[PDB]
Design a protein around this motif. Structure first.
Motif, mmCIF file in Angstrom:
data_model
loop_
_atom_site.group_PDB
_atom_site.id
_atom_site.type_symbol
_atom_site.label_atom_id
_atom_site.label_comp_id
_atom_site.label_asym_id
_atom_site.label_seq_id
_atom_site.Cartn_x
_atom_site.Cartn_y
_atom_site.Cartn_z
ATOM 1 N N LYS A 50 -4.175 -0.637 -4.263
ATOM 2 C CA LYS A 50 -4.109 0.845 -4.286
ATOM 3 C C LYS A 50 -2.844 1.367 -3.548
ATOM 4 N N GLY A 51 -1.939 2.036 -4.295
ATOM 5 C CA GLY A 51 -0.695 2.609 -3.733
ATOM 6 C C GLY A 51 0.585 1.907 -4.216
ATOM 7 N N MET A 52 0.430 0.836 -5.018
ATOM 8 C CA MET A 52 1.551 -0.036 -5.450
ATOM 9 C C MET A 52 2.330 0.537 -6.668
ATOM 10 N N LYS A 53 1.599 0.920 -7.735
ATOM 11 C CA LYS A 53 2.209 1.477 -8.972
ATOM 12 C C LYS A 53 2.942 2.818 -8.702
ATOM 13 N N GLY A 54 4.209 2.911 -9.147
ATOM 14 C CA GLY A 54 5.030 4.116 -8.941
ATOM 15 C C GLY A 54 5.947 4.021 -7.715
#
Length: 132
Positions: free
Chosen positions: A79-83
């Motif tokens: 959670k928080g990795m993509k982007g």
């Protein structure tokens, strides 16, 4: 390693993989990368994160990403990795395996783990045998 083979994981991203007996459920010949990024959702900077591959990254474009190049991650292993904005620490040519192991830290069953390399694995038959 072959698909259907048993292997013992020596070097590991998760603590539950060190000393664990994995099963090779897939064997992939792709370009692998070590990237450093700060999670856009307000998370602690993940430094020297691995492994992320060519089809894991948007800004890859099927070109060789050089040490110092910055790219955005389409996939997320947490959670928080993509982007998040990632920078290539190292460019690697290794065989990366999708494996099934039991998390030795707890005793939980985990499948399709991504990614582990020939460096990070030892064979069930040829135990202790590493290539360097």
């Amino acid at each position: 390693m072959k698909v259907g083979s048993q292997v013992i994981i020596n070097t590991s991203h998760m603590k539950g993989m060190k000393g664990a007996e994995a099963t090779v459920t897939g064997a992939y010949d792709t370009t692998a990368y070590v990237v450093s990024y700060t999670p856009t959702n307000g998370g602690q900077r993940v430094d020297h994160h691995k492994w992320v591959i060519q089809e894991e990254i948007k800004d890859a474009g099927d070109k060789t990403l050089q040490p110092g190049d910055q790219v955005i991650l389409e996939a997320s292993h947490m959670k928080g990795m993509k982007g998040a904005t990632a920078e290539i620490d190292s460019a690697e040519k290794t065989t990366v395996y999708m494996v099934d192991y039991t998390s030795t830290t707890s005793g939980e069953k985990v499948k399709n783990h991504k990614w582990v390399t020939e460096d990070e694995l030892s064979a069930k038959l040829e135990h202790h045998h590493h290539h360097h």
